Amino acid sequence: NKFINTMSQVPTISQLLPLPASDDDDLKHKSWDYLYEPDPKALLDTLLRRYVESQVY
Amino acid sequence: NLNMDLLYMAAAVMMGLAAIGAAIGIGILGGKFLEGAARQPDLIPLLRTQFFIVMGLVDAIPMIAVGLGLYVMFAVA
């Protein structure tokens, strides 16, 4: 359920995997690109796992 | 006579080693420059100033060598 208001709430079903195509657009990443320690893809996997955990919470 | 035959050889060896030294020195120094410019576009004008500041000292001795090579070749002859 979603706590839309103090007075009203609604039941919902939302897809958490695969990652939804949220807009999430910026191009400022050119100015600050992360130095991936140890690897970029390893960090990305841990980030996705944390994100799913966070959305469930 | 023999003098000029060896003096062209002397100038040759000196400027050849100078060429290798200077060229590979600036090659490495510039390689770090380009990689440092790669990731972030912000400070190209900044690194390209530190580049000349250091590149001056790279060329310090090789132009002593070149000056003396030219000196041998055109004035000791």
* Fold of domain B1-75: F1FO ATP Synthase (1.20.20)
CB B58 within 8 A of CB B29: yes
In chain A, residues 8-37 whose CB comes closer than 8 Å to chain B: 30-33
Give me the resolution in angstroms, 1 decimal.
4.0
What's A2's DSSP letter? B
As given in the structure block, the two tokens for residue B18 are: 């100078």
Experimental method: cryo-EM
Which one from B19, B21, B37, B59 is the annotated catalytic residue? B59
Which residues is B43 bridged to in the sheet?
none
Interface test with B, best of A27, A28, A31 (most B CBs within 10 A): A31
- Transcribe B8-65 into DSSP letters: HHHHHHHHHHHHHHHHHHHHHHHHHHHHHHHH-STTHHHHHHHHHHHHHHHTHHHHHH
Annotated catalytic residue B59: yes
Name the residue ranges covered by the structural domains of chain B.
1-75
Distance from CA of B32 to the nearest CA of A (A): 16
